[PDB]
């Protein structure tokens, strides 16, 4: 019942016989998932939650940064003070769910109110030792492979009137996205081994957007809701950037963030980029060319990272664009419901 701050531990299903890098890091750094999850509901309670000021997020930040240091080693790392050249071996890459638990003398409070916006009081509270499994999926614009909202879309913002405050959206309708790099023979041949594409069903996304647009009109009354491409920035933001199978995907989302979306299946152009801007620290990291064979990732869109157009309103239309780049917000989208 007291606000607390201490180091926590992770529990995974990491298998020691696994060469996948997340497991290697998880087997060595996490304890097995508790066999029986004990959760205690409190029948008459209230506590104030702040998803935007939570040490749990900053803790997973330090963890997900550590993972990427074992898994994805750049051939060259340029920062403001240092230059690194090293071996950049390829690795088998897959996110595995991570559970976050409280040590002895501490417990975790979980909001079970289905429509909690992440800031303020929740009339209904529970206590568990360990959080649900969260894949540390690193991405921009689109939130992938996260937990989904029970009843209705949720809008999370520290302050919506603050246009500089990122807007996390949690969906009630997962939308399947497949990004593939088609198979082709070798790097020496004439083929462009960095050409890639995604396929998202047009009707699914177009109708999901309408539901997001609907939930946003409730926080902005008497206004039109518009989705337009990114106003600019690094390539990681202006494109759906993420890592699929150890390779860095940059998927241009002009076809997704459009006011009128076609019914028919959508095809997004992507590119595998060696040269990437690091989210762990401010700097550039260069990775080796892509591996041979087919690279595919069937992922589920469960949330968004949006940024509203500021300034005087031209047409009484509030424009939201895709954004990201601070992976802590990705973690908040999951750990919003927990506090210690």
């Amino acid at each position: 019942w007291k606000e607390a701050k201490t180091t926590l531990f992770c529990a995974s299903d990491a298998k020691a016989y696994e060469k996948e890098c997340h497991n290697v890091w998880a087997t060595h750094a996490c304890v097995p998932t508790d066999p029986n999850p004990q959760e205690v509901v409190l029948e008459q309670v209230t506590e104030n939650f702040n998803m935007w000021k939570n040490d749990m997020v900053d803790q997973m930040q330090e963890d997900v940064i550590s993972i990427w240091d074992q898994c994805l080693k750049p051939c060259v790392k340029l920062t403001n003070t240092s230059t690194l050249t090293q071996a950049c071996p390829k690795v088998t890459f897959d996110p595995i769910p991570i559970h976050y638990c409280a040590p002895a003398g501490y417990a975790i409070l979980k909001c079970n109110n289905k429509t909690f916006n992440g800031k303020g009081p929740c009339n209904n509270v529970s206590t568990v030792q360990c959080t649900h499994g969260i894949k540390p999926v690193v991405s921009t614009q689109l939130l992938l492979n996260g937990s989904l909202a029970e009843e209705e879309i949720v809008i999370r913002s520290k302050n919506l009137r603050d246009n500089a405050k990122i807007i996390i959206v949690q969906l009630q309708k997962s939308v399947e996205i497949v990004c593939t790099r088609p198979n082709n023979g070798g790097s020496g041949s004439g083929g462009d081994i960095r050409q890639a594409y995604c396929q998202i069903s047009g009707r699914n996304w177009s109708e999901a957007v309408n539901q997001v647009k609907k939930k946003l009109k409730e926080h902005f009354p008497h206004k039109n809701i518009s989705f337009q491409s990114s106003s600019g920035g690094d390539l990681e933001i202006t494109t759906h950037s993420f890592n699929c199978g150890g390779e860095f995907f940059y998927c241009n989302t002009s076809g997704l963030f459009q006011d009128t979306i076609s019914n028919a299946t959508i095809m997004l152009p992507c590119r595998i980029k060696q040269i990437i801007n690091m989210w762990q620290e401010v700097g550039k990291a260069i990775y080796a060319p892509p591996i041979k064979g087919q690279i595919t990732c069937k992922s589920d869109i469960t949330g968004l990272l949006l940024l509203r157009d500021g300034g005087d309103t031209t047409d009484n239309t509030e424009i939201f664009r895709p954004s990201g780049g601070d992976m802590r917000d990705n973690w908040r989208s999951e750990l919003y419901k927990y506090k210690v």
Binding site: A164, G232, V282, D309
Partner: peptide, 20 residues
Amino acid sequence: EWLGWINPLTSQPSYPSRFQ
């Protein structure tokens, strides 16, 4: 008059419609 803001961490800029 407002020209816009930029996020030094993530590089993200936001502009007003007039100067878009």
